[PDB]
Paper text:
Inoviruses are filamentous and rod-shaped, roughly six nm in diameter, that contain a single-stranded DNA (ssDNA) genome. [name] also promotes antibiotic tolerance of [name] by self-assembling into higher-order liquid crystalline structures. The CoaB subunits adopt a 77-Å-long, α-helical structure, with the C-termini pointed toward the core of the phage and the N-termini directed toward the outside of the cylindrical filament.
We used real-space helical reconstruction to resolve a 3.2-Å resolution structure of the [name] phage. [name] filaments show a rise and rotation per subunit of 3.14 Å and 65.90°, respectively, allowing multiple CoaB molecules to pack tightly around the filament axis in an interdigitated array. Density for the ssDNA genome inside the 22-Å cavity in the core of the [name] phage is clearly resolved. Unexpectedly, this density shows that the [name] ssDNA genome is linear, rather than circular ssDNA, which was the expected paradigm for members of the Inoviridae family, since it was proposed for the related bacteriophage Pf1 (10) as well as fd. The pitch of the linear ssDNA is 15.7 Å, meaning that there is exactly one CoaB protein for every base of ssDNA in the phage genome. Analysis of the interaction between CoaB protein subunits and the linear ssDNA genome (in the [name] structure with ssDNA) shows weak contacts between arginine 44 residues and the phosphate backbone of the DNA.
Author numbering:
A (entry chain A), B (entry chain A), C (entry chain A), D (entry chain A), E (entry chain A), F (entry chain A), ...: 1 to 46
Write the structure that this text describes.
């Protein structure tokens, strides 16, 4: 009496493979305010 | 069952390319108070 | 058996075109406290 | 399906025009401790 | 088949006219710690 | 459809009248290290 | 068709009378780091 | 409708009685660099 | 034609007497991060 | 009509007994930068 | 007229035994930003 | 009635092994402004 849920794992494993894609696109934008955070500290201490 | 997230990386890679633009516009204004910080020290020691 | 959702994309693409308008009106007000943040530092160091 | 956001830019452009007003009222009070900072140095060196 | 929403704008335009009243009562209390913030700096530098 | 906010201004105008009281109690303690700062300079120069 | 809300004001006026009690217990602990903040400044200037 | 806050004043009056303990342990270490600051001045003037 | 609701007030007055019991068990755990919040401030200022 | 909440106080009194354990492990690490803060001041004044 | 709920406690006591497992896996990742939070403070004070 | 959480510890132990990697990449950049902080002090004292 089953219902075919084969279209579930095919849909959301491709879903969770897309959460990883837009996680790496944020990490690449948070290191901008990490690098610029501490080369401001070099100019101030000088 | 995917949703097209192709408009994400096209939107925020151009976003993080703009954080770099206004980071270099601050560094050019912090060296003003680095140079003027230590040519004041030459006049005082004289 | 469809329902005409043509009035959806006509309504919210004009919606997301208005989020961009009031995003640029905030950026123009946050640079006021960025510029005035570091010309206070010039007067203090003098 | 828009919502009239015409009352937004009319409200905060007049808002950011007021941040400039109270920025210039602080600069006029930080030059007091810049001028008095270095006419104390004239009396001490004498 | 409308429902009279005339009691809405009469109720919340008088509501948002009261948010402005208690916004100006806070600004009058944040300038106390702005003025006293920098007449402490005059006594310390002396 | 208002809510009585008459207990707000009665509560925080008496609040900001108390920030002024403990601001003047600090100024009376910072002039101790201003006066003693420069009658030490008289004894050293002698 | 009312519901007796007489147990409301009896419960939260005694509630807001207790927020005042633990506000005064914090003020008595923030003046410790205000007094000790500026008798450290007397020892350093000496 | 109260909540027993009797465990508050029993917890932080013993808390603020401990801020006083580690304030007096710092004052005993700042007088070391006050005494040694001005018996260096006796050796230099000799 | 009533239905005996005498088992209601006997069940939920003992219910609301138990909400007070686990409210006082949280207040005893929030004062831990209130006391430790400001004896960290004594060590940093020293 | 009660629900047995005897597993509550047994769970969070052991919870708040663990907040005290990791509070004392931080105090032991903030005195490192208190002691080293003022034996740097002895070397500089010498 | 009962219904066998013996499969309930066998299912959720093993459920709450798994909430404890992934609670300890978070605590092991929050101490990374506690240790690195205050060995940054040693390098800055030096 | 369990749910397989074996993919949890495999995912976040590799997660917390990556927090350590980018902690050591910051420590290597804070010692730059520690070394340069005190070879500036040698040039000034000379």
């Amino acid at each position: 009496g089953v219902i075919d849920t084969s279209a579930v794992e095919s849909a959301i494993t491709d879903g969770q493979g897309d959460m990883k894609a837009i996680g790496g696109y944020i990490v690449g934008a948070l290191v901008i305010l990490a690098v610029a955070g501490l080369i401001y500290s070099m100019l101030r201490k000088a």
